[model samples]
Target: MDETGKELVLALYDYQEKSPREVTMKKGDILTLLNSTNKDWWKVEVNDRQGFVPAAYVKKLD
Candidate 1:
Protein backbone atom coordinates (compact mmCIF):
# COMPACT_ATOMS: atom_id res chain seq x y z
CA MET A 1 0.00 0.00 0.00
CA ASP A 2 1.13 3.55 -0.70
CA GLU A 3 1.18 6.35 1.83
CA THR A 4 -1.87 8.60 1.96
CA GLY A 5 -0.54 11.39 -0.23
CA LYS A 6 0.60 9.23 -3.11
CA GLU A 7 -0.67 9.66 -6.64
CA LEU A 8 -1.91 6.91 -8.90
CA VAL A 9 -3.14 6.49 -12.42
CA LEU A 10 -6.38 4.73 -13.24
CA ALA A 11 -5.81 1.44 -14.98
CA LEU A 12 -9.36 0.60 -16.05
CA TYR A 13 -12.95 1.73 -16.07
CA ASP A 14 -14.82 1.32 -12.74
CA TYR A 15 -18.42 2.44 -12.38
CA GLN A 16 -19.88 -0.22 -10.09
CA GLU A 17 -20.99 1.88 -7.17
CA LYS A 18 -24.10 3.13 -5.40
CA SER A 19 -22.49 5.07 -2.57
CA PRO A 20 -21.40 8.69 -2.27
CA ARG A 21 -18.02 7.20 -1.48
CA GLU A 22 -17.86 5.56 -4.89
CA VAL A 23 -15.95 7.21 -7.71
CA THR A 24 -16.50 6.53 -11.39
CA MET A 25 -13.30 6.44 -13.38
CA LYS A 26 -11.95 5.88 -16.86
CA LYS A 27 -8.66 4.49 -18.05
CA GLY A 28 -5.68 6.79 -17.55
CA ASP A 29 -7.36 9.12 -15.09
CA ILE A 30 -5.04 10.63 -12.52
CA LEU A 31 -5.96 10.06 -8.86
CA THR A 32 -4.56 10.95 -5.51
CA LEU A 33 -4.29 7.87 -3.31
CA LEU A 34 -5.87 8.61 0.04
CA ASN A 35 -6.53 5.44 2.05
CA SER A 36 -5.79 1.77 1.44
CA THR A 37 -6.37 0.12 4.79
CA ASN A 38 -9.03 -2.00 3.11
CA LYS A 39 -7.36 -4.78 1.20
CA ASP A 40 -9.46 -4.53 -1.95
CA TRP A 41 -10.32 -0.85 -2.07
CA TRP A 42 -8.51 2.44 -2.00
CA LYS A 43 -9.81 5.93 -1.29
CA VAL A 44 -9.03 8.41 -4.05
CA GLU A 45 -9.98 11.72 -5.55
CA VAL A 46 -10.28 13.46 -8.88
CA ASN A 47 -11.88 16.74 -9.93
CA ASP A 48 -12.45 17.63 -6.25
CA ARG A 49 -14.60 14.52 -5.62
CA GLN A 50 -13.47 11.85 -3.22
CA GLY A 51 -14.38 8.15 -3.11
CA PHE A 52 -13.19 4.60 -2.93
CA VAL A 53 -12.16 2.68 -6.01
CA PRO A 54 -11.02 -0.88 -6.64
CA ALA A 55 -7.34 -1.20 -5.84
CA ALA A 56 -6.73 -3.40 -8.85
CA TYR A 57 -8.11 -0.68 -11.09
CA VAL A 58 -5.33 1.83 -10.47
CA LYS A 59 -1.60 1.90 -10.92
CA LYS A 60 1.08 4.00 -9.27
CA LEU A 61 2.44 6.82 -11.36
CA ASP A 62 6.07 7.88 -11.08
Candidate 2:
Protein backbone atom coordinates (compact mmCIF):
# COMPACT_ATOMS: atom_id res chain seq x y z
CA MET A 1 0.00 0.00 0.00
CA ASP A 2 1.11 3.58 -0.62
CA GLU A 3 1.26 6.42 1.87
CA THR A 4 -1.81 7.68 3.74
CA GLY A 5 -2.84 10.01 0.92
CA LYS A 6 -1.08 8.39 -2.03
CA GLU A 7 -2.91 6.34 -4.63
CA LEU A 8 -1.94 3.09 -6.31
CA VAL A 9 -2.72 1.58 -9.68
CA LEU A 10 -5.41 -1.04 -9.25
CA ALA A 11 -7.18 -3.45 -11.56
CA LEU A 12 -10.69 -2.74 -12.77
CA TYR A 13 -11.88 -6.31 -13.12
CA ASP A 14 -12.41 -9.62 -11.40
CA TYR A 15 -10.48 -12.43 -13.08
CA GLN A 16 -10.74 -15.51 -10.94
CA GLU A 17 -13.56 -17.48 -12.47
CA LYS A 18 -14.11 -18.97 -15.89
CA SER A 19 -15.79 -15.89 -17.31
CA PRO A 20 -13.86 -12.92 -16.01
CA ARG A 21 -15.26 -9.47 -16.62
CA GLU A 22 -13.34 -6.26 -17.05
CA VAL A 23 -14.47 -3.70 -14.48
CA THR A 24 -13.68 -0.47 -16.20
CA MET A 25 -12.63 2.52 -14.14
CA LYS A 26 -12.11 6.24 -14.69
CA LYS A 27 -11.02 9.33 -12.78
CA GLY A 28 -12.47 10.08 -9.31
CA ASP A 29 -12.95 6.42 -8.58
CA ILE A 30 -13.05 5.93 -4.84
CA LEU A 31 -11.74 2.41 -4.38
CA THR A 32 -11.84 0.86 -0.96
CA LEU A 33 -9.54 -1.98 0.03
CA LEU A 34 -11.30 -3.66 2.87
CA ASN A 35 -9.79 -6.02 5.43
CA SER A 36 -10.75 -9.66 5.22
CA THR A 37 -10.10 -12.85 7.11
CA ASN A 38 -10.55 -15.69 4.59
CA LYS A 39 -11.31 -13.94 1.33
CA ASP A 40 -8.33 -13.64 -1.01
CA TRP A 41 -9.87 -11.18 -3.42
CA TRP A 42 -9.53 -7.40 -3.63
CA LYS A 43 -12.32 -4.91 -4.26
CA VAL A 44 -11.78 -1.90 -6.52
CA GLU A 45 -13.83 0.82 -8.15
CA VAL A 46 -14.86 0.55 -11.78
CA ASN A 47 -16.67 3.62 -12.94
CA ASP A 48 -19.92 3.55 -10.96
CA ARG A 49 -19.66 0.21 -9.19
CA GLN A 50 -17.21 -1.77 -7.08
CA GLY A 51 -15.33 -4.56 -8.82
CA PHE A 52 -13.70 -7.46 -7.09
CA VAL A 53 -10.44 -7.41 -9.04
CA PRO A 54 -7.68 -9.82 -8.33
CA ALA A 55 -4.86 -8.73 -6.09
CA ALA A 56 -2.33 -9.44 -8.82
CA TYR A 57 -3.17 -6.28 -10.78
CA VAL A 58 -2.90 -3.67 -8.03
CA LYS A 59 0.41 -1.95 -8.78
CA LYS A 60 2.28 0.12 -6.26
CA LEU A 61 3.05 3.60 -7.46
CA ASP A 62 6.74 4.48 -7.39
Candidate 3:
Protein backbone atom coordinates (compact mmCIF):
# COMPACT_ATOMS: atom_id res chain seq x y z
CA MET A 1 0.00 0.00 0.00
CA ASP A 2 2.98 2.29 0.43
CA GLU A 3 3.87 2.24 -3.27
CA THR A 4 0.79 4.13 -4.44
CA GLY A 5 2.39 6.83 -6.64
CA LYS A 6 5.83 5.27 -6.89
CA GLU A 7 4.88 2.09 -8.69
CA LEU A 8 6.29 1.20 -12.10
CA VAL A 9 5.17 -1.37 -14.63
CA LEU A 10 5.98 -2.93 -17.98
CA ALA A 11 3.72 -3.25 -20.98
CA LEU A 12 3.23 -6.75 -22.29
CA TYR A 13 1.43 -5.82 -25.52
CA ASP A 14 0.56 -2.99 -27.83
CA TYR A 15 -2.35 -0.82 -26.77
CA GLN A 16 -4.06 1.02 -29.58
CA GLU A 17 -4.93 4.60 -28.71
CA LYS A 18 -8.52 5.44 -29.58
CA SER A 19 -8.77 8.96 -28.17
CA PRO A 20 -6.88 11.82 -26.56
CA ARG A 21 -7.64 10.58 -23.06
CA GLU A 22 -6.24 7.13 -23.94
CA VAL A 23 -2.62 6.12 -24.43
CA THR A 24 -0.65 3.72 -26.56
CA MET A 25 2.25 1.52 -25.48
CA LYS A 26 4.22 -0.99 -27.48
CA LYS A 27 5.62 -4.20 -26.13
CA GLY A 28 8.56 -3.92 -23.72
CA ASP A 29 7.95 -0.30 -22.81
CA ILE A 30 8.16 0.90 -19.22
CA LEU A 31 5.27 2.97 -17.87
CA THR A 32 4.84 4.89 -14.66
CA LEU A 33 1.52 4.09 -13.03
CA LEU A 34 -0.27 7.14 -11.67
CA ASN A 35 -3.83 6.15 -10.63
CA SER A 36 -5.42 2.71 -10.65
CA THR A 37 -8.75 3.47 -9.03
CA ASN A 38 -10.49 2.05 -12.08
CA LYS A 39 -10.34 -1.70 -12.33
CA ASP A 40 -10.21 -1.81 -16.12
CA TRP A 41 -8.48 1.23 -17.55
CA TRP A 42 -5.98 2.78 -15.18
CA LYS A 43 -4.06 6.03 -15.55
CA VAL A 44 -0.41 5.79 -16.66
CA GLU A 45 2.36 8.25 -17.28
CA VAL A 46 4.46 7.95 -20.40
CA ASN A 47 7.26 10.48 -20.69
CA ASP A 48 5.16 13.15 -18.96
CA ARG A 49 2.10 12.24 -21.03
CA GLN A 50 -0.79 11.10 -18.89
CA GLY A 51 -3.51 8.86 -20.28
CA PHE A 52 -5.63 5.81 -19.64
CA VAL A 53 -4.69 2.21 -20.45
CA PRO A 54 -6.04 -1.25 -19.84
CA ALA A 55 -4.86 -2.77 -16.57
CA ALA A 56 -4.21 -6.16 -18.16
CA TYR A 57 -1.62 -4.72 -20.53
CA VAL A 58 0.83 -4.00 -17.70
CA LYS A 59 2.72 -6.12 -15.21
CA LYS A 60 4.13 -5.11 -11.82
CA LEU A 61 7.78 -4.06 -11.85
CA ASP A 62 8.55 -5.64 -8.49
Give each model a TM-score. Answer: 0.67, 0.37, 0.77
lDDT per residue as tens, model 3, 1-62: 76665678789888888999988888799888887778888788777678998878877677
Off by over 4 Å in 2: 1-5, 10-40
Looking at model 3, which ten-residue stretch has the lowest summed lDDT?
1-10
Highest TM-score: give the candidate number.
3
Q: Model 1 reaches what TM-score against the true structure?
A: 0.67
Q: Decide which is better by lDDT, 1 or 2.
A: 1
Worst 10 residues of 1 by lDDT: 2-11
Error of 3 at 37 (Å): 1.0
Q: 60, model 2: CA deviation in Å?
A: 2.5
Worst 10-residue lDDT window for candidate 2 reads: 13-22
Ranked candidates, highest lDDT first: 3, 1, 2
RMSD of each: 3.5, 6.5, 2.3
What's model 2's TM-score? 0.37
Better of 1 and 3 by TM-score: 3
Off by over 4 Å in 3: 1-5
